[PDB]
Design a protein around this ligand. Sequence first.
Ligand SMILES: Nc1ncnc2c1ncn2[C@@H]1O[C@H](COP(=O)(O)OP(=O)(O)OP(=O)(O)O)[C@@H](O)[C@H]1O
Ligand SMILES: Nc1ncnc2c1ncn2[C@@H]1O[C@H](COP(=O)(O)OP(=O)(O)OP(=O)(O)O)[C@@H](O)[C@H]1O
Ligand SMILES: CC(C)CCC[C@@H](C)[C@H]1CC[C@H]2[C@@H]3CC=C4C[C@@H](O)CC[C@]4(C)[C@H]3CC[C@]12C
Ligand SMILES: CC1(C)Cc2c(sc(NC(=O)c3cc[nH]n3)c2C(N)=O)C(C)(C)O1
Ligand SMILES: [Mg+2]
Ligand SMILES: [Mg+2]
Length: 1179
Amino acid sequence: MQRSPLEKASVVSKLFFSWTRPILRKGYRQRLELSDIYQIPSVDSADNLSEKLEREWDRELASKKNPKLINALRRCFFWRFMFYGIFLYLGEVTKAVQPLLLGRIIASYDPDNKEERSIAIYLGIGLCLLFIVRTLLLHPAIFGLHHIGMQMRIAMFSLIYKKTLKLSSRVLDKISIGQLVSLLSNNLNKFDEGLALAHFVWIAPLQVALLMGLIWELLQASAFCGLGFLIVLALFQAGLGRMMMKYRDQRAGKISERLVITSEMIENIQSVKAYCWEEAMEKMIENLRQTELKLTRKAAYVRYFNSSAFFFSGFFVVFLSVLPYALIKGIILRKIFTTISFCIVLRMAVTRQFPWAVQTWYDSLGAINKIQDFLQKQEYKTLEYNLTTTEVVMENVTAFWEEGFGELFGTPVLKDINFKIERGQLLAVAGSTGAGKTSLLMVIMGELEPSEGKIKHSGRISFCSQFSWIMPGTIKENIIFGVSYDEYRYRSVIKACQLEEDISKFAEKDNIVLGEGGITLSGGQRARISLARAVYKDADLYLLDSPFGYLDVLTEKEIFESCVCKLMANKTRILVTSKMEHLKKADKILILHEGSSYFYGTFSELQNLQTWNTYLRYITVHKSLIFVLIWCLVIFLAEVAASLVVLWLLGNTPLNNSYAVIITSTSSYYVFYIYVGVADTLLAMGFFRGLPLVHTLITVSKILHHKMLHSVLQAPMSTLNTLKAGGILNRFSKDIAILDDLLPLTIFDFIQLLLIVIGAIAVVAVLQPYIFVATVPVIVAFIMLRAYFLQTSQQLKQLESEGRSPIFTHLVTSLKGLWTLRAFGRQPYFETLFHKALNLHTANWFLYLSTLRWFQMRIEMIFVIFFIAVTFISILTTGEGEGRVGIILTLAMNIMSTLQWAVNSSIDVDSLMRSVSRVFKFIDMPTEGDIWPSGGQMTVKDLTAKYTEGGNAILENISFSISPGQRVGLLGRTGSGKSTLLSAFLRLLNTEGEIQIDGVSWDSITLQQWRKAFGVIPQKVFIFSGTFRKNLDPYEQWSDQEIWKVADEVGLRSVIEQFPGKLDFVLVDGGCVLSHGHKQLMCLARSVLSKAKILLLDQPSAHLDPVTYQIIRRTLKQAFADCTVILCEHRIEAMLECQQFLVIEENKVRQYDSIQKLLNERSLFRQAISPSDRVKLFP
Ligand SMILES: Nc1ncnc2c1ncn2[C@@H]1O[C@H](COP(=O)(O)OP(=O)(O)OP(=O)(O)O)[C@@H](O)[C@H]1O
Ligand SMILES: Nc1ncnc2c1ncn2[C@@H]1O[C@H](COP(=O)(O)OP(=O)(O)OP(=O)(O)O)[C@@H](O)[C@H]1O
Ligand SMILES: CC(C)CCC[C@@H](C)[C@H]1CC[C@H]2[C@@H]3CC=C4C[C@@H](O)CC[C@]4(C)[C@H]3CC[C@]12C
Ligand SMILES: CC1(C)Cc2c(sc(NC(=O)c3cc[nH]n3)c2C(N)=O)C(C)(C)O1
Ligand SMILES: [Mg+2]
Ligand SMILES: [Mg+2]
């Protein structure tokens, strides 16, 4: 990491921006190098800006009665804000005095021997000094304001991330990820570039006042008559402004809902492919875009008029100003031209510098109000009493989930519970699915607050959750979790939890980079990592929320008899389980039922009791766009043609005529200048040209989004495991929102300005030849410098754009596994780990932003250097009568001002066109590519299974056969590959060989027609945000009578009726409202509905007790009558059902007929069988 070159630089280097020079010549030749990226300055790091504003915000909360975040921002930015403002004012004031000096220098060409001839050279010196001071005065202040804006945004982002870690469990149901992602995604680049525009609120009026006097000098009455039009027009723009911000708050609700559905489906696509929900998910996201794009088009139509009230305004402000003066006194051309030159600045001042400033003040204060509202929310309170005898006591506790019933006090999830726990003994928390075993642990931790009751234990606590959580990094970084490493401790934990088997099979033994959630690992490997993280942590109380769900009986007994009773057996460790073997060794038991203590005591008592290609693939998506652009061009040619014959007639005039005074001298070199100043309205796009162009460009972004979401869904599994969660979420959030909002209007201004310059040069050139030759040296200079800059700029804009993914990826896992962070107390780790993501983004963004003003300053310096050269060549070579050299040259240099503005607009288009480039990389991803399943007999031959292309083979030379309508058991040790065998049939991972069914093979049929044969219950359950009927069938094939008919057999009768809207209750936060057992029953009903003659069950019973498991065999015997069943399951009770058994080990299979034979070979596995389950197998 090289340190920032801004730190050690002369004022000249910081004034002329020479310190950014190295990376351009480095980036021009070569591809950009990671070494060449500079470390952020010490001023604008995450830590200090957090430090600074954190200190002010609590001072603000302490002092005032109703605090405001703007007051906290004021005390740390206001002086450095206003310091740049006064330079930006003087830099803008010097534009208004330019027509006074230049005006006379144009007038001095007139042969009528005026006094100007005399002063011209002094204006010549003065006007050169005038340009030099502005070029220096403006750009440092803009960079200064961008630099302050960047510091404000980093400070607020840091305060949101600290606030969200202390946020209440009550609030998490209300605020989804789409709320947080959208808030950051909106502000990320909009807030920084805004503070350049923000000052023109108070610059523009003083500018209007200063200009109105200078016009009042020329025209006494009419100038006010003109101004009235701009007051008339300014109120119309303010009307569009308030209209456009009411269309944006209707849409803002819709965007959040789209991101939560898009995130959820791509996070667990492996289920989405198994069920075959492509059309279902696409049609769902399609319906959310309908409302969004309706509001986008409406907000875009009002935005055009706001950005089209400057070009049209031009002609009418001058016309209404000169007309009244013309009728009474008469006018000289020298008076009309002067007015034109003042007018252009005034409109710039009042029609694109005033409506862009206020619009920035609304958005900034709106964004700050949402952040301030987000900071003032219900916090997770902590109340831990270190002083204790280490006796975990609970007495007379009740608890409700929601606020309403709890506050008004629906049945509470706990009531009338009480227990006493000495230090060095484990509690056996037992009961049926929906007893409140997770809820009890949530009360012990303090996530769920009890209405009536009291809890007390010491602050130190460990927590192994039911849904296992894996942060992004190495298995080591997961197991130790933000603390020092201890060789003796870490190794002893891994042998206790016995991951030694699973860790040794990996290529990189200890440390492999796991993704967001850890889908590289199976269910058993995640559970034991979560348990290892819990065990490696040291605390007074260990909470274990059923870690033996996904484990086989051999692993379950060894890990129980190796960790729970060996590694920790001198402390209070409440556990969740439902087996006799675990309750025997346990000292105290608590059997919950319907949120009530059925029993409490001991085991003995209980028995007693009972680039060109990017710019070309974006124009040829939609045919309307190419018709509209051709339609604009033919109308453009017509007005260029119309103006040419107007100026032909006007110039060729043979001229009491007070109306407009002209002489042979003045005529020739004012008539052309008048046209150049009024060529911004004549060659303007109307509501015939501008409307459809905006309409089509939004239609392009709708088509691009459809293709992108379509391509991501049907791409192969390897390409989707390669990329992160935040990388997916970044594009659909930020990159698709740029094609909807900014990019359609950014192209409009670029085309408008480009047409004005082309058409201006065209009419001037055809009528007077040498001005085209005069423009060419300045034209080539701008194109030269532009081509040079874009080589570095395009490479910085990709490192910066892809630099966003760290911030989002981190924000997902932070919010996803929030309960474990506060359990272990690892906020200081995650805050400092989050600061690195901001510093990374700042490092790239600051670099790109600073490179731009270099370009912005250099192109103005080029224009100044040429204008200085033109002015003295003009003034010095002026004849005794009628100097023609200056007449030709200054006309060109009036055009180059409009082109300078167009080149700056061109760089804003290329920066936004990067986004469309990054969308097209997702569109260009590879594709995975009588009655048929009558009986459902499978024949596998020479099968091989591996995830990565040319990696390690998980299964090797697999072959076996199932006869029709036969139930088949599948089993083996955790991490054997059982899922891989189920994924091999669906062929989600790439395989070799053939699996032929009912005498017909893979290659005979398409893949989507193939996957409709099977009926899947996956290991990881997927419940998207919607109604129960939407989850149970997205296609809406089955009736309510049908779904209610299924709902009783699998037993969601009592589950659904609990909630208000029966089959209309909108599930949230990935179905957090339902318990873990109900999610397994949800996937069962989903498979029961889909009548399939083959069906695949990946551990249907995960954390179901023996009572709930009767439903599984009830529905498996009755509903699945004739169809063949592959049952992948750990519990031995399930083996009584199915005939043939498939055992997996050593990357190969073995098939067995009877159970007696199979269990006979293996002794340790037969000795793991429960005594209650041993009397069933053997009679
Ligand atoms: N966030 C929540 N909001 C509202 N109700 C909830 C929430 N979480 C759980 N519940 C309800 O509380 C009851 C008990 O939940 P809990 O998860 O503690 O049961 P459990 O015994 O742990 O389930 P399982 O045996 O499947 O692990 C369930 O009926 C469930 O509907
Ligand atoms: N997506 C993947 N990419 C790479 N390797 C994988 C992937 N999924 C699984 N593996 C590897 O394959 C091994 C076995 O895979 P699989 O997920 O089928 O185990 P399993 O039998 O389902 O486990 P469990 O018994 O816990 O359900 C894992 O131990 C892991 O090393
Ligand atoms: C800083 C600004 C807002 C102050 C007010 C505007 C200034 C520019 C205005 C207010 C009064 C104006 C003056 C009013 C009358 C005359 C006399 C005339 O023969 C030459 C111009 C001159 C001298 C004007 C120059 C511009 C002027 C000085
Ligand atoms: C904002 C807007 C309504 C934009 C606008 C105008 S005026 C105008 N077009 C015309 O005059 C016109 C004439 C022929 N074809 N178009 C527009 C517009 N965008 O078309 C004004 C009034 C300044 O203000
Ligand atoms: Mg539970
Ligand atoms: Mg599995």
